[PDB]
Design brief:
It is classed as toxin. The structure is a homopentamer. Chain A is about 20% helix and about 40% strand. Chain A is an alpha+beta fold. Chain A has a single domain (about 1-115), classed as OB fold (Dihydrolipoamide Acetyltransferase, E2P) (Beta Barrel). In chain A, strands 3-2-1-4-5 form a five-stranded antiparallel beta sheet, covered by helices on one side. The longest helix of chain A is centred in the middle third of the chain and has 14 residues, at about 60-70. At the A-B interface, strand 1, strand 2, helix 1 and helix 2 of A face helix 1 and strand 5 of B.
């Protein structure tokens, strides 16, 4: 598996507008909400669950990086894997997307896979 | 269990106004005080205790997040489970609330569970 | 044991003015000096030692919190237990006070035991 | 093995201008892009992969240090070992350079091997 | 052993002017260069190496503290133990000094052993 696998989904030129931290089923988790920097389109919501899924090892790295980009409001590419989380109220509150990477976008194309 | 369980309580548009770090019964812990951004109501106090209660796994995550929101002073939604800490002197100084989640807020909506 | 126990001592309306980190007998340690925010009184010196005393479990949390309040310079209540450290040269450089808690203070109250 | 081995390459007076975090083959990784502060030259891309290559042990230290220099914009020397990563889409997105060191730079020299 | 043992050396009223992070013999390490705050004297160079030397337990504490003092530029006392690192190329690039403590300094004094 790889953040960059074409079977994942990415959204370029976004900003992290909201951040949530909590716990589910004995695992820490966080979710972010992102929107296009220019206000077009619809938000993206993705979560990381520290104990769950193949992406679990990257939980702390992703949380630290989400926190930094959330604090700066700089443009980013968000990378997700769709349809991972299953608890109905959780998915309804947030989404089923697992967060699988974050790329800065300070230049013409974001610094990450496409 | 989940931060968003309906048996938990939450308080929207709160500012984390105070922070305390200490130790009880072998466990580092922290507590925060929060107040409505609009100044109404009565303060909320909630604590997390390392290796104690079902919420123990998220102790570090919540401490780091409380520190961040405390430093910015932004309005957040605080999620707690009532009646978790039972040490009476501790409860009298702070509260029995376990902190179980923190959500950032726009002017109109906080990013976390509700209802 | 508890930070708020009557057998501990506290000092309110203090600012953390100095910070030191070192190692003693295989254990990292740190010390802080605090002075009354209004200039009165005698300074307070306390240390935490990562592998020593009943307060060992809270070393990293107090180190992080001391660093935070040291960087902001804000008014705090410092909680100590006296007569803990025993190495005479260490005590004479710093003190025998173990650091057992840190509470933020507003103008006329602090958020912690008293 | 050492950051300063003659078999590694380095680039001075560079500024970290992009940062990416993700995961590949169960391993967290990050990549950075640096460009000459004076605008000359070709960008340098390098990645660290938490449990791959002989440089795996320094992943967290270099991630944290990359974050710091990225946030200040200061001029640094970046040390890499060439031709390490092999997954083609990863290498073509980023590069094959492993990140093996970061050194602050002054006007005339930098603080590290050369 | 203690940071404050008379057999260690210290240098007062210094500023951390350079920071380097790398890896050697499976260990992430960092070195710092410090100079007198008033601009006089000759620079000091010290390193801390993960999992190496009796000072290994304090590696992360010293790294975090060095980064903070480096970021502020404030006056500090640096404590070292001479003749610890033996790799000649490493010593020739940096030095044999192990970093063993860091103390904040006021205009008046430094908060640490002397």
């Amino acid at each position: 598996e790889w953040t960059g696998d074409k079977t994942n989904a990415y959204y370029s030129d976004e900003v992290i507008s909201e951040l949530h931290v909590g716990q589910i089923d004995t695992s820490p988790y966080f979710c972010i909400k992102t929107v296009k920097a220019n206000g077009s389109g619809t938000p993206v919501v993705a979560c990381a669950v520290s104990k769950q899924s193949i992406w679990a090892p990257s939980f702390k790295e992703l949380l630290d990086q989400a926190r930094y980009f959330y604090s700066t409001g700089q443009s980013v590419r968000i990378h997700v894997q769709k349809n991972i989380w299953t608890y109905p109220l959780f998915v309804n509150t947030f989404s089923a997307n697992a967060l699988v990477g974050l790329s800065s976008c300070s230049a013409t194309q974001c610094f990450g896979p496409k």
